[model samples]
Target chain A: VKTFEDLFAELGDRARTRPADSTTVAALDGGVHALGKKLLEEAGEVWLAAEHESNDALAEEISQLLYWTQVLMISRGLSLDDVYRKL
Target chain B: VKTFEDLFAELGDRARTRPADSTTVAALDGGVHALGKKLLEEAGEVWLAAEHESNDALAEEISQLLYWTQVLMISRGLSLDDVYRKL
Candidate 1:
């Protein structure tokens, strides 16, 4: 399987070339919806994990969630860094 | 339902799919992190809606977060239009 980093890099390259059109916009729309779901799921899980005192699991899950998030940003024509600054 | 166009729209896609990601090397990390933060917030709410897990309230909250996020993107490094394209 392609590593996440590889996939992300490829996405960036393709973005530079083809870029997003209406269909892309639609895809972005769908992606935004889908990714947003995952982000929150993990977040909630993280909270629950923390509440349960599963610190290691919570951190691990949070990490995975964030990684997926990075992919989500790339897919939508945003970058990981962009998401970070405002936070 | 009431007209809420003024309410907001779905996020710029991928609010949820992220996993264990990190900050951008440049300013990208911040934008990546901040907008990303909103994305996750919206995402959590959307799932709550779909699962009947919560209600429209959750989705609405997600939408608002996304709207604010888009604004933040402009603050840091992008526009709504160019978002269709990669930098």
Candidate 2:
């Protein structure tokens, strides 16, 4: 039921309100490296998927890729709209 | 005015349809490592902003983070929905 804005908003709130709630947003709350590493791993998979998988499968890969990207977005207090403007 | 889904969808199309149009999607069309490195750099900036800057500044960093992330996703053939489901 949540929109990208909602998710980003919530994460922004959490970053300020609960910078210590390590359990809730572990990877994000902890630091940036973990997310960066995972983002790369997923990115690599996307390349592999494009080469061997069907369109549906590729979508799934893209899904994970964006998920992490969006998570990073929220961690930094941004919204989907902010990203769109940048694009 | 495009939705996140629309952006992801268009990127998906581009990935498959014009993987060779390097001028259009240069970084993404090039390789995964560049995206990975940039993701890390942005992630680091998010931390720096959190430590030294205001909320708005952090959002700018996050916006860059997500922008790059979304580009990686499209290059890899994924979507916003895929990212949300993972969360």
Candidate 3:
């Protein structure tokens, strides 16, 4: 299994290299606050999926939640390790 | 003027020392995703205040927006400087 640390490292690099017009980069340009909203929205979906959906649905929601989490982390020049140490 | 950098430093410390049941820490325990949502929600109110409210109203919205932004940062073990360097 790919550790989240490794996955985020790849995401961080891809986010940096992606074209300005790319969907990911464009969404990020909406700024940190906008991204934060999406993160929370995804988390809410995860909770809902857990309560009323199949494992596949839960997995999808969890994946989206992780994506937004990493995006927020990278936007602030942070890594998962930084968040881990605080815990 | 107390720079935002200074302000966030104080918030970060207060956040760490705050009791689990204190409103501030309690909100953070709702996690990074929740904090992100609050930050975005505050930004939206700031825009509305600018369009239809008094200067004081706008200021209040802006302060709330900044508070949520800082909370999101501290939750990730990041500082305002970290965000600045990314930009």
On lDDT, the stronger of 1 and 3 is: 3
Query: After superposing candidate 1, which stretches have Cα over 4 Å from the reference?
Result: A1-30, B1-87
lDDT of 1 by residue, B38-79 (tens): 545665654554344333344344344445434344334333
Please state the CAPRI-style docking class of candidate 3: incorrect
List, residue by residue over B13-82, the lDDT tens digit for candidate 2: 6666776755536776577667756755776676566566776776677566656666766665455665
Candidate 2 stretches greater than 4 Å from native: A6-22, A25-87, B1-24
Candidate 3, RMSD to the unseen true structure: 11.0
| Better DockQ candidate (2, 3) | 2
| Listed models, DockQ each | 0.06, 0.21, 0.04
Which candidate do you rate higher for TM-score, 2 or 3? 2
| DockQ of candidate model 3 | 0.04
Q: Write the number of the candidate with greater lDDT, choosing between 2 and 3.
A: 2
How accurate locally is residue B67 in candidate 1, as Cα lDDT from 0 to 100? Answer: 50
TM-score for all models, in order of appearance: 0.36, 0.53, 0.48
lDDT per residue for candidate 2 within A46-70, as digits (tens), equals: 6666566775776676556656666
Model 2 / residue B61 / CA error / Å = 0.9
Error of 1 at B82 (Å): 36
Off by over 4 Å in 3: B1-87
Give the DockQ (C-alpha) for candidate 1.
0.06
Return the lDDT, model 1, position B41: 60
- RMSD (Cα, Å) of model 2: 5.9
